[PDB]
């Protein structure tokens, strides 16, 4: 358009470009639109493209001051949703110039800011986002990544083992350290603060960090293996968050943890840069993901949140446990684990991967499994996740009949037996019981652990 | 309740019973099957936690024969009978070790 | 190369990839090489590629710790210099 004509106009006239070929620099988004009957697909797609980028509900003269053809987001492909005729996939291209470089915040705000509120759609689901390599290079990414972390902690050949201290709340700092000490001395690589553990009247953070570090060092001396505890630095303000991170560095804590959604992307990105500058590993908890990621018709798929975390920065990311998930959602889970860890993920619709995602040199992130998992889950966990994973057994350790040290040893024996059997070429999931039963003959801890919880 | 007895450990597989020749052989074979280069490290027991153990000769880049690896382990053991001895497998694609485990515990 | 063999080796064997197609992420350099008579073009191009990136005058075992195929710079095209037969353009991808 070259002349200014005021009034309301249809989004399709400008934001639906079926013949557009996305550039390599473009950010691409796949939205699953469940529109209200009566609204046209192209118009729904164009409306999402316009409102997420440069469009307005009515024509504004200021558009003529700039070149909307260059800047505008454009819907370029419509596809059916397999097996769901109420919904369709809209593919929208966004010029890279629309986004602040190195800002997952800005890109996220633009894509999810207000399109989710449209009365035209019954539901809007952001399925996938193609971050071009040019954008990826502007982002800090994981402060260390899988390989650097293994070198720093001198851990090779197996998944790492972790435990969340339980109960989630209520323990004093000294008792918290006692629980940490017992878990670590028994064979866990890591222990962690619960996501809810920040600084509470029952346990102030500085007291917690001191006792935990004492526990970590004592266990490390007594086992001859490196140990860590993810100290939660999630805090009310950035100043408080950095203060806690600095104290962890000062006392020699190798790893800290943060809640990137609840704490927020701005805080997380700053923390990730701080972690890289100070050599501290960063474990990321995904609290609130289920609020946003569960509903298949409305929200954001976790795979998108996974990509944002890798760009924002974390050395570990909580990924849930595939054991609970059904086979339909298993392939999707394997999909985002590849996104978390691999360098190049090719497009694969069966796994929910709508775009080729190139990470280039950006390091991979440890996948973290947790939940109500215990020794019996070990074979399936080792199979699904592989070596570059952290398996966290909170209840499965502190709930052992003989205490944390025995529970840790039971999990450690189960893990090592599964790994040894895998390396020998056995099908660990098929032979899981036999493997665990054989290992239990040499470990009373594993034996009673297998009796405590059911297969 | 049984009391858990604290003792020093040696990382991967150290919580399992000590490996016979067959178990050790299977791990080396797996490493070669992955395309990893086996290597041997050794160190004085008190220095076990150092980042840099002594390297025995060079990593056996492209070694396909597990018997050669086992012979090297014996040769390292003979040269340094009090040292702990660790088998490693270099993964040049990840520039990390694919596996590492202590074959002899030292002293 | 998978095994370590010490000694001096020709740069061409590794750093001259006439069939390489540069990636979009690659940094490309065009050098006008005026070589001394007796030296081969490809070897001159490969030598520039090796020394500007990952190469060494002699074989080092540490190469085997990493993946030189991924990291190495590679000369991928040789062209004549129009009107100057003493010189040639070497195109190297990094």
């Amino acid at each position: 358009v070259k002349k200014y004509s005021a009034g309301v106009k249809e989004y399709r006239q400008t934001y639906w470009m079926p013949e557009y070929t996305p550039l390599d620099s473009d950010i691409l988004a796949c939205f699953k639109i469940t529109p209200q009957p009566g609204v046209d697909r192209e118009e729904a797609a164009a409306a999402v493209a316009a409102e997420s980028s440069t469009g307005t509900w009515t024509t504004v003269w200021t558009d003529l001051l700039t070149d909307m053809d260059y800047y505008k987001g454009r819907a370029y492909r419509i596809e059916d949703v397999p097996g769901d005729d109420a919904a369709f996939y809209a593919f929208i291209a966004y010029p890279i110039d629309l986004f602040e470089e190195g800002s997952v915040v800005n890109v996220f705000t633009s894509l999810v800011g207000n399109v989710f509120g449209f009365k035209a759609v019954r539901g809007l689901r952001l399925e996938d986002v193609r971050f071009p390599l040019a954008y990826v290079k502007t982002c800090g990414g994981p402060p260390h990544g899988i390989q650097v972390e293994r070198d720093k902690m001198n851990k090779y050949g197996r998944p790492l083992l972790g435990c969340t201290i339980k109960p989630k709340l209520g323990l004093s700092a000294k008792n918290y350290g006692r629980a940490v000490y017992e878990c670590l001395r028994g064979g866990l690589d890591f222990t962690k603060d619960d996501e809810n553990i920040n600084s509470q009247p029952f346990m102030r953070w500085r007291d917690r960090f001191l006792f935990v570090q004492d526990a970590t060092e004592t266990a490390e001396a007594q086992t001859g293996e490196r140990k860590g505890h993810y100290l939660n630095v999630t805090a009310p303000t950035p100043e408080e968050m950095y203060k806690r991170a600095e104290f962890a560095k000062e006392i020699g804590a190798p790893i800290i943890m943060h809640d990137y959604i609840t704490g927020g992307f701005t805080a997380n990105t700053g923390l990730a840069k701080w972690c890289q500058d100070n050599g501290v590993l960063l474990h990321i908890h995904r609290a609130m993901h289920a609020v946003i990621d569960r509903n298949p018709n409305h929200g954001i798929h976790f795979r998108v949140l996974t990509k944002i975390l890798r760009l924002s920065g974390g050395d570990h990311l909580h990924t849930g446990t595939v054991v609970g998930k059904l086979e339909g959602d298993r392939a999707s889970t394997l999909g985002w684990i590849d996104l978390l860890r691999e360098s190049f993920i090719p497009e694969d619709r069966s796994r929910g991967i709508f775009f080729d995602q190139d990470w280039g040199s950006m390091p991979g992130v440890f996948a973290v499994a947790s939940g109500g998992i215990h020794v019996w889950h070990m074979p399936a966990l080792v199979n699904i996740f592989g070596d570059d994973s952290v398996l966290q057994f909170g209840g499965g350790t502190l709930g052992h009949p003989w205490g944390n040290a025995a529970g840790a040893a039971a999990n450690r024996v189960a893990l090592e037996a599964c790994v040894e059997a895998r390396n020998q070429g056995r099908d660990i999931e098929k032979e899981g019981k036999e493997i665990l039963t054989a290992a239990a003959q040499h470990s009373p801890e594993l034996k009673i652990a297998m009796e405590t919880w059911k297969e | 309740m049984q009391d858990y007895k604290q003792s020093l450990k040696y990382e991967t597989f150290s919580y399992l019973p000590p490996m016979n020749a067959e178990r050790i052989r299977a791990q080396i074979k797996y490493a070669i099957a992955q395309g990893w280069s086996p290597g041997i490290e050794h160190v004085e027991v008190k220095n076990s936690m150092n980042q840099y153990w002594y390297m025995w000769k060079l990593p056996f880049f492209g070694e396909q024969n597990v018997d050669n690896v086992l012979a090297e382990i014996e040769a390292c053991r003979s040269a340094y009978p009090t040292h702990q001895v660790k088998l490693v497998a270099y993964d040049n694609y990840a520039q990390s070790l694919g596996l590492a485990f202590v074959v002899y515990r030292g002293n | 190369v998978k095994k370590y063999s010490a000694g001096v080796k020709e740069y061409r064997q590794t750093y001259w990839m006439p069939e390489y197609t540069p990636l979009d992420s690659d940094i490309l350099a065009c050098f006008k090489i005026t070589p001394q008579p007796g030296v081969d073009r490809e070897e001159a191009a490969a030598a520039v590629a090796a020394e500007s990136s990952t190469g060494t005058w002699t074989t080092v075992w540490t190469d085997l710790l990493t993946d030189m195929d991924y990291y190495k710079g590679r000369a991928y095209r040789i062209e004549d210099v129009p009107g100057d037969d003493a010189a040639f353009y070497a195109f190297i991808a990094y």
Binding site: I146, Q147, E342, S343, F344 | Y93 | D67, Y70
Partner: peptide, 9 residues
């Protein structure tokens, strides 16, 4: 891992 399955490969 890492470099084994790059886009170039």
């Amino acid at each position: 891992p890492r470099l084994d399955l790059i886009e170039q490969a």
